[PDB]
Design a protein around this ligand. Structure first.
Ligand SMILES: [Cl-]
Ligand SMILES: [Cl-]
Ligand SMILES: [Cl-]
Lengths: 244, 244, 61, 244
């Protein structure tokens, strides 16, 4: 046989480049996944991730309470934290024994897979009683925030999109939903509606609290080939198109 | 300038009337919210509210268990209440140490925002194992109960719709779902289907147990300009159309 | 005050006392403890020192 | 340039020798620290260290109770140990459920930094009610025990001084204070008294219970370049004067 890495008959090299290209392109086909992650960062350094993976479109929606830190199998000050919630829902509404709950998120990162169409991204960032813009009567139910998403890139390829916003102020008390649609550069749509309804049942969810961004990088993002952007602006992910 | 409240050049008064009219009409446009609330009233006077706010259509669906009273950070008789549930799912199916759980709802109020179309309201009121009408085989999956909704009115304007039913009997053990569609007096529909799919992800939920109807009125309904009907038949809400 | 003495202590409430012994070992020497958190919220975020107007500022140490 | 380690123009080598010499001599100047450590060894192998670091002079003073083992976040038999203390303060004074508390120290090591003047070292080793020599009326308030301190040496240099005494007998129940003064080979003293008063406020204390002498060596003594003497008579510390 020809010698490795010297001719156009290195079929092992050609098949390795096709294998990776086929994964990138499959994920962008309408047979592929679109995915979103919501990362809620806490002051003790831990991070709640919620991920949803589905065909055609995907989203996540959480109450104010559901985004607060919860330590499985440890003390969580549960009664005082009911009181904190009443004070956040309405000024002076609760009888808590603290000024600031450390279970409140300090920041949120939203990341989408590279198969989303950025122009279809919508966010409903609500107040603590789940109203998008002060009162229901004047609320548009979402904002299209795609222009704010940064490209997470590796070796020149877009591996995901990120929108990050801090919640560093005492009055930063939110409920949150986000949604994006999978790329569809074709004009095909008619005939597939019940398949989209089934995708709403088939979407898979994952939720976990990791103890540190380091642990998120090492045990969550990297083993699953997911995109990420860390606090030092370092991009993680795997470039696949035309690559060995 | 002209003197206040004496001429057609009180532009502050004209803009205040337009500001309110624009909120009422915006909420009724297809860009606006439609909202539903389920209130489950307990014998200790506390009230669980679940609210969902979304574009185009909105609903809530809860199991028998999910509507039982839960006191965050307090004792809830959790083991005995598993046994009560088994006895409610099938006669004599559990080994509880009580006849009647005080965590069972004594009544339900369903309220919709004034942007719902009443004729589109559907309720699935199921038995304790989540079957709408005794056996699945003979069950229609909902009843259209709009004729029973009363107008909640303030100063002559409809601020919401209410359906209330008591559960005062021992055998009143229910699971519950409700759904309504936002007004659409136009013939526009085609082209918008994926936007409705995204609304299913973007819908915002809120849930909380308030300790008294008084507290619900003062800290929940009134601060958010929501409609309500109290046990004394008093209507709450804010009239906006053509009003200062 | 020692490092430990300046950490938050909530009288009559839970203070994660065993995990916080482990956090202290990790602060005294890298990787010295086996805590279940990255950052203890009991660590001070800031310090203000105030003196009465009867101090001589040049003597402050 | 000249080649490394072959001529009098290896200024990197000269500066490395000066850097170390300057640390040794600085610590011996009156601008430098004098330090003391009290190590209380327990039968479970754990070791309480108390360290004080201050200018001009330094000391540690602890009650009988304060030197007993305390396990943070674990059970400490606290009520029985109050009873043990009453029995140690006066024969038959308590109603404990044990003969010998394992929280009593089995031995004490006192170590001073090499900047102490050994002739100034004073110890008040008291009985369990904090009396130095049986009754107050006949007590001298300290003993000058410098003659008993051994030199802890590395590579020919004194890196600290140690006095060690076991408490292996049932009646070995002590309170303890120790004090040493920083070297002052000059005749300067007058003018500096308020600076010594400020040193009493500025002295820094450290206290911790390590689980084993190994852990004390690896995580406490060695990382901070402190002197120590282990149970096998091995000297730890770092020689600095005229050394690279
Ligand atoms: Cl396709
Ligand atoms: Cl419209
Ligand atoms: Cl000097």
């Amino acid at each position: 046989a020809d010698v490795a890495g010297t001719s156009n008959r290195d079929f092992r090299g050609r098949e390795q480049r096709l294998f990776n290209s086929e994964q990138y392109n499959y994920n962008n086909s309408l047979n592929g996944e679109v995915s979103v992650w919501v990362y809620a960062y806490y002051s003790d350094g831990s991070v709640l991730v919620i991920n949803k993976n589905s065909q055609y479109k995907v989203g996540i929606s959480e109450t104010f309470k559901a985004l607060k830190e919860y330590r499985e199998g440890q003390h969580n000050d549960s009664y005082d934290e009911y009181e904190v919630n009443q004070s956040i829902y309405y000024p002076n509404g609760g009888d808590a024994r603290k000024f600031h709950s450390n279970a409140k998120p300090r920041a949120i990162q939203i990341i989408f897979s590279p198969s989303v169409n950025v122009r279809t991204i919508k966010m409903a960032k609500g107040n603590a009683v789940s109203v998008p813009d002060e009162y229901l009567q004047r609320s548009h139910p979402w904002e299209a925030t795609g222009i704010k998403y940064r490209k997470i890139k590796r070796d020149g390829e877009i591996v995901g999109y990120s929108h990050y916003f801090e919640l560093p102020h005492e009055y930063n008390s939110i409920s949150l939903a986000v949604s994006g649609v999978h790329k569809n550069p074709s004009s095909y749509n008619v005939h597939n509606v019940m398949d989209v309804f089934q995708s709403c049942d088939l979407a898979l969810r994952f939720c976990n609290r990791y103890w540190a961004e380091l642990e998120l990088v090492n045990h969550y993002i990297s083993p699953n080939a997911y995109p990420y952007l860390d606090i030092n602006n370092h991009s993680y992910g795997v470039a696949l198109s035309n690559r060995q």
